[PDB]
Design an enzyme around this catalytic site. Structure first.
Site, PDB file in Angstrom:
ATOM      1  N   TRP A 199       0.885  -1.190   0.000  1.00  0.00           N
ATOM      2  CA  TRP A 199       0.000   0.000   0.000  1.00  0.00           C
ATOM      3  C   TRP A 199       0.907   1.219   0.000  1.00  0.00           C
ATOM      4  O   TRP A 199       2.091   1.022   0.305  1.00  0.00           O
ATOM      5  CB  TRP A 199      -0.963  -0.029   1.166  1.00  0.00           C
ATOM      6  CG  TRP A 199      -2.193   0.791   0.959  1.00  0.00           C
ATOM      7  CD1 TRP A 199      -2.497   1.975   1.577  1.00  0.00           C
ATOM      8  CD2 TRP A 199      -3.283   0.506   0.087  1.00  0.00           C
ATOM      9  NE1 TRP A 199      -3.717   2.442   1.150  1.00  0.00           N
ATOM     10  CE2 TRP A 199      -4.200   1.566   0.199  1.00  0.00           C
ATOM     11  CE3 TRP A 199      -3.569  -0.534  -0.787  1.00  0.00           C
ATOM     12  CZ2 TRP A 199      -5.383   1.604  -0.518  1.00  0.00           C
ATOM     13  CZ3 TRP A 199      -4.749  -0.501  -1.526  1.00  0.00           C
ATOM     14  CH2 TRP A 199      -5.653   0.566  -1.376  1.00  0.00           C
TER      15      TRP A 199
ATOM     16  N   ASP B 214       0.480  11.142   0.017  1.00  0.00           N
ATOM     17  CA  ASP B 214      -0.551  12.180   0.086  1.00  0.00           C
ATOM     18  C   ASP B 214      -1.881  11.524   0.458  1.00  0.00           C
ATOM     19  O   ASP B 214      -1.991  10.285   0.443  1.00  0.00           O
ATOM     20  CB  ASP B 214      -0.598  12.927  -1.256  1.00  0.00           C
ATOM     21  CG  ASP B 214      -1.120  12.112  -2.400  1.00  0.00           C
ATOM     22  OD1 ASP B 214      -0.588  10.988  -2.578  1.00  0.00           O
ATOM     23  OD2 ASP B 214      -2.018  12.515  -3.138  1.00  0.00           O
TER      24      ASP B 214
ATOM     25  N   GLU C 212     -18.597   7.691  -4.217  1.00  0.00           N
ATOM     26  CA  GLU C 212     -17.297   8.353  -4.204  1.00  0.00           C
ATOM     27  C   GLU C 212     -17.252   9.343  -5.397  1.00  0.00           C
ATOM     28  O   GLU C 212     -17.028  10.548  -5.199  1.00  0.00           O
ATOM     29  CB  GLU C 212     -16.110   7.440  -4.301  1.00  0.00           C
ATOM     30  CG  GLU C 212     -14.716   8.094  -4.296  1.00  0.00           C
ATOM     31  CD  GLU C 212     -13.629   7.057  -4.466  1.00  0.00           C
ATOM     32  OE1 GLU C 212     -13.502   6.661  -5.649  1.00  0.00           O
ATOM     33  OE2 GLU C 212     -12.983   6.692  -3.512  1.00  0.00           O
TER      34      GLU C 212
HETATM   35  O1  LIG Z   1     -12.053   6.114   1.353  1.00  0.00           O
HETATM   36  C1  LIG Z   1     -10.851   5.333   1.299  1.00  0.00           C
HETATM   37  C2  LIG Z   1      -9.718   5.934   0.438  1.00  0.00           C
HETATM   38  N1  LIG Z   1     -10.106   5.896  -0.931  1.00  0.00           N
HETATM   39  C3  LIG Z   1      -9.306   6.513  -1.892  1.00  0.00           C
HETATM   40  C4  LIG Z   1      -8.937   7.980  -1.516  1.00  0.00           C
HETATM   41  O2  LIG Z   1      -7.922   8.545  -2.395  1.00  0.00           O
HETATM   42  C5  LIG Z   1      -8.392   8.034  -0.088  1.00  0.00           C
HETATM   43  O3  LIG Z   1      -8.231   9.389   0.363  1.00  0.00           O
HETATM   44  C6  LIG Z   1      -9.365   7.356   0.890  1.00  0.00           C
HETATM   45  O4  LIG Z   1      -8.785   7.328   2.226  1.00  0.00           O
HETATM   46  O1  LIG Z   2      -5.647   3.758  -8.943  1.00  0.00           O
HETATM   47  C1  LIG Z   2      -4.900   4.381  -7.882  1.00  0.00           C
HETATM   48  C2  LIG Z   2      -5.794   4.518  -6.613  1.00  0.00           C
HETATM   49  N1  LIG Z   2      -5.308   3.614  -5.651  1.00  0.00           N
HETATM   50  C3  LIG Z   2      -5.615   3.680  -4.304  1.00  0.00           C
HETATM   51  C4  LIG Z   2      -6.072   5.038  -3.742  1.00  0.00           C
HETATM   52  O2  LIG Z   2      -7.109   4.795  -2.758  1.00  0.00           O
HETATM   53  C5  LIG Z   2      -6.651   6.006  -4.777  1.00  0.00           C
HETATM   54  O3  LIG Z   2      -6.672   7.373  -4.315  1.00  0.00           O
HETATM   55  C6  LIG Z   2      -5.819   5.957  -6.073  1.00  0.00           C
HETATM   56  O4  LIG Z   2      -6.403   6.841  -7.047  1.00  0.00           O
END
Ligand SMILES: OC[C@H]1NC[C@H](O)[C@@H](O)[C@@H]1O
Ligand SMILES: OC[C@H]1NC[C@H](O)[C@@H](O)[C@@H]1O
Ligand SMILES: *[C@@H]1O[C@H](CO)[C@@H](O[C@@H]2O[C@H](CO)[C@@H](O[C@@H]3O[C@H](CO[C@H]4O[C@H](CO)[C@@H](O)[C@H](O[C@H]5O[C@H](CO)[C@@H](O)[C@H](O)[C@@H]5O)[C@@H]4O)[C@@H](O)[C@H](O[C@H]4O[C@H](CO)[C@@H](O)[C@H](O)[C@@H]4O[C@H]4O[C@H](CO)[C@@H](O)[C@H](O)[C@@H]4O[C@H]4O[C@H](CO)[C@@H](O)[C@H](O)[C@@H]4O)[C@@H]3O)[C@H](O)[C@H]2NC(C)=O)[C@H](O)[C@H]1NC(C)=O
Ligand SMILES: *[C@@H]1O[C@H](CO)[C@@H](O[C@@H]2O[C@H](CO)[C@@H](O[C@@H]3O[C@H](CO)[C@@H](O)[C@H](O[C@H]4O[C@H](CO)[C@@H](O)[C@H](O)[C@@H]4O[C@H]4O[C@H](CO)[C@@H](O)[C@H](O)[C@@H]4O)[C@@H]3O)[C@H](O)[C@H]2NC(C)=O)[C@H](O)[C@H]1NC(C)=O
Ligand SMILES: *[C@H]1O[C@H](CO)[C@@H](O)[C@H](O)[C@@H]1O
Ligand SMILES: *[C@H]1O[C@H](CO)[C@@H](O)[C@H](O)[C@@H]1O
Ligand SMILES: *[C@H]1O[C@H](CO)[C@@H](O)[C@H](O)[C@@H]1O
Ligand SMILES: *[C@H]1O[C@H](CO)[C@@H](O)[C@H](O)[C@@H]1O
Ligand SMILES: *[C@H]1O[C@H](CO)[C@@H](O)[C@H](O)[C@@H]1O
Ligand SMILES: *[C@H]1O[C@H](CO)[C@@H](O)[C@H](O)[C@@H]1O
Ligand SMILES: *[C@H]1O[C@H](CO)[C@@H](O)[C@H](O)[C@@H]1O
Ligand SMILES: *[C@H]1O[C@H](CO)[C@@H](O)[C@H](O)[C@@H]1O
Ligand SMILES: *[C@H]1O[C@H](CO)[C@@H](O)[C@H](O)[C@@H]1O
Ligand SMILES: *[C@H]1O[C@H](CO)[C@@H](O)[C@H](O)[C@@H]1O
Length: 470
Positions: A119, A175, A399
C-alpha cells in the site's frame, strides 16, 4: 427552495448512512469491530471494506461537532471509536509498532488486524486527523466535569499521535490520495493544526507537549513554501500541475472561525486561498463534458486533480462539496469581521463573479460588499446543486459521479461523502467548529529549519468509561 429543503433531508440521510458504516452494530458493515469506521460497505470493485485512519478521523471529528451542538445520541459512537483507537495504536503493521512508526499506517482490516499487502504507506496525516477528533471530545469531557476521562484516556491517546507528528513531519510519505510519495500540503496543514491544539489540550489536563510547542512554528514555516505565487502546490516531488482539491480540504479542515483572512495559515477568506480556489476549480471546467457550456461565474463539477485517471478521472462528491464549503467559511469570516478586502492576489477570484471588482476594503454596509457576498453565496450553492443533481434518489452519496453523464461510480455509500455533506451544510447554516487557537499560531519564523522533536509513546488501556450522561 429545492436546495434548502434537499439539504435538510440530506443531512438526516447522511447522519444515518454514517452510522450504518460503523461497527459493531452498523447495518451495512457486519464484521466491523466496535467503533470501527468503514470507508464504504463495497467489498469488491472497488474493495473499500477497511478502516482508514483519515476517513475515520474526518468522520468522527464531524460527529464530535454534531454532538457538541446537541446530538447527544452520538455519545456511544464516539466512546466506541476512542476505545477502538486505544487498540489500533498498538497494532503492529507494515509501518511498524506504536513507538516505531505504526501510527502512520493508512488502513486496517475492519476486525482490527493489520492490512499486510502493499500500500502507499505511510500516510502522515492520519495521526494528526485522529488527534484533532479526540481533542474535540476531550474538550467536551473537561467542560462537562469528566476530568478523569479527559486526563486518563483521551490525553494519553492524543499524546501518542502528537508524538508521531512532531517526530516525522519533515519526512516524505504519501498524500491523502495515496499516490504521491513526497510532501503534501493537506498533510502539513492538518499537522500544524494538531500540534497547536494538542498543546492547548495538554495544558488543560495539567500536562504539557514540549514537542508540540517547538515544532508547530517550524511546520508553519515550511507550509509557506507551498505558495507558488498564483496557487497552492498540492505536492512537492510531483510532475503534475499541482492544482488539487487537496488544497481546498487543507483550508476547510484547518478553518478557525476566530481567525482573520490570514495567508500564513491559508484560511478560507485569505487572498491566497481565494486565488487558489479559482485555479483549482477552473482546472476542471474544460476536462469534464458535464461542465460543457458553463461560464466562469458558474459552479462546476470538481474532481481531485486535472490529471486524475482513477476510474478515468471524474468529479467527486467530496471535492465538489469542499469547493462550496470554503466559500461558506469565507462568507462567515467576512460577516464576523464586518468587511472584505480585494487585493491583487484575489482580484481574479472576485472579478469572475463580480465584473466591477476592484482592490480596496469593503465594509459590510457597502454596496460592493452586498453585491460580492450575494454572488459568492450563489456560486457556493451552485456546487451544492451539482451534488443534489447527481445524488441517488434515496440520497446515496458515492465516491464519484461520471464526468460525462453524472451517474454514480466507484465506492457506493462512501462515509467520507456523507461527512463532507454534513460539514458543507453546517457551514452553509453558519454552524462553525470550535476554534483551535489559530490566532496565536499564525506568526511565521524568520528562518525555517529541517527538524523534528521526539515525544513519548505509551500504550493506553481503556478499562472503563465513566457513566457519562449528555
Ligand atoms: O475512502 C478510502 C480511500 N479511498 C481513496 C482515496 O484517495 C483516499 O483518500 C481514501 O482514504
Ligand atoms: O488507482 C490508484 C488509486 N489507488 C488507491 C487510492 O485509494 C486512490 O486514491 C488511487 O487513485
Ligand atoms: C439507497 O438505495 C440504494 C439502491 O438500493 C442502496 O444501495 C444498495 O444497498 C444494498 C445494501 O442494503 C447493497 O447490497 C449489497 O450488494 C453487494 C453487491 O454489489 C454489487 O452488485 C450489485 C448488483 O448487481 C450492484 O448494484 C452493486 O453496485 C453498487 O456498488 C458498486 C460498488 O461499490 C458501485 O460502483 C455501484 O455504483 C453501485 O452503487 C455492486 O456492483 C453485495 O455484495 C452485498 O452483500 C453483502 O452484504 C449483505 C448485507 O448487507 C450480506 O447479506 C451479503 O452476504 C454480503 O455480505 C458481505 O459483504 C458485507 C459488506 O457489504 C459484509 O458486511 C459481510 O460480512 C460479507 O462480507 C464477506 O464477504 C466479502 C467478500 O467480497 C469480504 O470482503 C468480507 O470481508 C466478508 O468476508 C449487499 O447485498 C446494494 O449494492 C446497493 N445498491 C446500489 C446500486 O448501490 C442504498 O444503500 C440506499 N441508500 C440509503 C442512504 O438508504
Ligand atoms: C523539511 O523542512 C525543510 C525546511 O522547511 C524543507 O526545506 C524546504 O523545502 C522547500 C521545498 O523544496 C524549499 O523551497 C524551494 O525553494 C527553491 C529555491 O529556494 C525553489 O526553487 C522551489 O520551487 C518550487 O516550489 C515553488 C513554490 O515554493 C514553485 O513556485 C516552483 O514551481 C517549484 O516547484 C516545482 O519544482 C519542485 C522542485 O523542488 C517540485 O517538487 C514541485 O512539485 C514543482 O514542480 C521551492 O520553493 C525551501 O527552500 C526549503 N527550505 C530550507 C530552509 O531549506 C524540506 O523540504 C522538508 N522536507 C520534507 C520531506 O518535509
Ligand atoms: C495569527 O497568529 C499570530 C500570532 O501567532 C498573529 O500575529 C496573527 O495576527 C494571527 O492572529
Ligand atoms: C511570531 O511567533 C512565532 C511563534 O509562534 C515566532 O517564531 C515568530 O518569529 C514571530 O515572533
Ligand atoms: C532540528 O533542529 C532544531 C533547531 O535547529 C533542533 O532544536 C531539533 O532538536 C532538531 O535537531
Ligand atoms: C526527529 O528527527 C531529527 C532530525 O532532524 C532528530 O534530531 C530528532 O532526534 C528526531 O529523530
Ligand atoms: C524519539 O526519541 C526519544 C528519545 O530517544 C524516544 O523516547 C521517543 O520514543 C522517540 O523514539
Ligand atoms: C515518554 O514520556 C511518557 C510520559 O512521561 C512516559 O510515560 C513514556 O514511557 C516515555 O518515557
Ligand atoms: C505510558 O502511559 C500510558 C498512559 O498513561 C500507560 O498506560 C502506560 O502504562 C505507560 O505508563
Ligand atoms: C498499547 O499497545 C499494546 C502493545 O504494545 C497493546 O497491547 C495495547 O492494547 C495498546 O494498544
Ligand atoms: C494498557 O494497560 C495494560 C495493563 O493494565 C497493558 O498491558 C497495555 O499494554 C496498556 O499499557
Ligand atoms: C483500568 O485500567 C487502566 C490501565 O491499566 C486505567 O488507566 C483505567 O483508568 C482503569 O483504572
Amino acid at each position: 427552495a429545492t436546495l434548502d429543503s434537499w439539504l435538510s433531508n440530506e443531512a438526516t440521510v447522511a447522519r444515518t448512512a454514517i452510522l450504518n458504516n460503523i461497527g459493531a452494530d452498523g447495518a451495512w458493515v457486519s464484521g466491523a469491530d466496535s467503533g470501527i469506521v468503514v470507508a464504504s460497505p463495497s467489498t469488491d470493485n472497488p474493495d473499500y471494506f477497511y478502516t482508514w485512519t483519515r476517513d475515520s478521523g474526518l468522520v468522527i471529528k464531524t460527529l464530535v461537532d454534531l454532538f457538541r451542538n446537541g446530538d447527544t445520541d452520538l455519545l456511544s459512537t464516539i466512546e466506541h471509536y476512542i476505545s477502538s483507537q486505544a487498540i489500533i495504536q498498538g497494532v503492529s503493521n507494515p509501518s511498524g509498532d506504536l513507538s516505531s512508526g505504526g501510527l502512520g499506517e493508512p488502513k486496517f482490516n475492519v476486525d482490527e488486524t493489520a492490512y499486510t499487502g502493499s500500500w502507499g504507506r505511510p500516510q502522515r496525516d492520519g495521526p494528526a486527523l485522529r488527534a484533532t477528533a479526540m481533542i474535540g471530545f476531550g474538550q467536551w469531557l473537561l467542560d462537562n466535569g469528566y476530568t478523569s476521562a479527559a486526563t486518563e484516556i483521551v490525553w494519553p491517546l492524543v499524546r501518542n499521535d502528537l508524538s508521531y507528528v512532531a517526530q516525522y513531519w519533515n519526512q516524505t510519505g504519501y498524500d491523502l490520495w495515496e499516490e504521491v510519495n513526497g510532501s503534501s500540503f493537506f498533510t502539513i496543514a492538518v499537522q500544524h493544526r494538531a500540534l497547536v491544539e494538542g498543546s492547548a489540550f495538554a495544558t488543560a489536563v495539567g500536562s504539557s507537549c514540549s514537542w508540540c510547542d517547538s515544532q508547530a512554528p517550524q511546520i508553519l514555516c515550511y507550509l509557506q513554501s507551498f505558495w507558488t505565487g498564483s496557487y497552492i502546490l498540492a505536492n512537492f516531488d510531483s510532475s503534475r500541475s499541482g492544482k488539487d482539491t487537496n488544497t481546498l480540504l487543507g483550508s476547510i479542515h484547518t478553518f478557525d472561525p476566530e481567525a482573520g483572512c490570514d495567508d500564513s495559515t491559508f484560511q478560507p477568506c485569505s487572498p491566497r486561498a481565494l486565488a487558489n480556489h479559482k485555479e483549482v476549480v477552473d482546472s476542471f471546467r474544460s476536462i469534464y463534458t458535464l461542465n460543457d457550456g458553463l461560464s466562469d461565474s458558474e459552479a462546476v463539477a470538481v474532481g481531485r486533480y486535472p490529471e486524475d485517471s482513477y476510474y478515468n478521472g471524474n468529479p467527486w462528491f467530496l471535492c465538489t462539496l469542499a469547493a462550496a464549503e470554503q466559500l461558506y467559511d469565507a462568507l462567515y469570516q467576512w460577516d464576523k469581521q464586518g468587511s472584505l478586502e480585494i487585493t491583487d492576489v484575489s482580484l481574479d477570484f472576485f472579478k469572475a463573479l463580480y465584473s466591477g471588482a476592484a482592490t480596496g476594503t469593503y465594509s459590510s454596509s457597502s454596496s460592493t460588499y452586498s453585491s460580492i457576498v450575494s454572488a459568492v453565496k450563489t456560486f457556493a450553492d451552485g456546487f451544492v446543486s451539482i451534488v443534489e443533481t447527481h445524488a441517488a434518489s434515496n440520497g446515496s452519496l458515492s465516491e464519484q459521479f461520471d464526468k460525462s453523464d453524472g451517474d454514480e461510480l466507484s465506492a457506493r455509500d462512501l462515509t467520507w461523502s456523507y461527512a463532507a455533506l454534513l460539514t458543507a451544510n453546517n457551514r452553509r447554516n453558519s454552524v462553525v467548529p470550535p476554534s483551535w487557537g489559530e490566532t496565536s499560531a499564525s506568526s511565521v519564523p524568520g528562518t525555517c529549519a529541517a527538524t523534528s522533536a521526539s515525544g513519548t509513546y505509551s500504550s493506553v488501556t481503556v478499562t472503563s468509561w465513566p457513566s457519562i450522561v449528555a
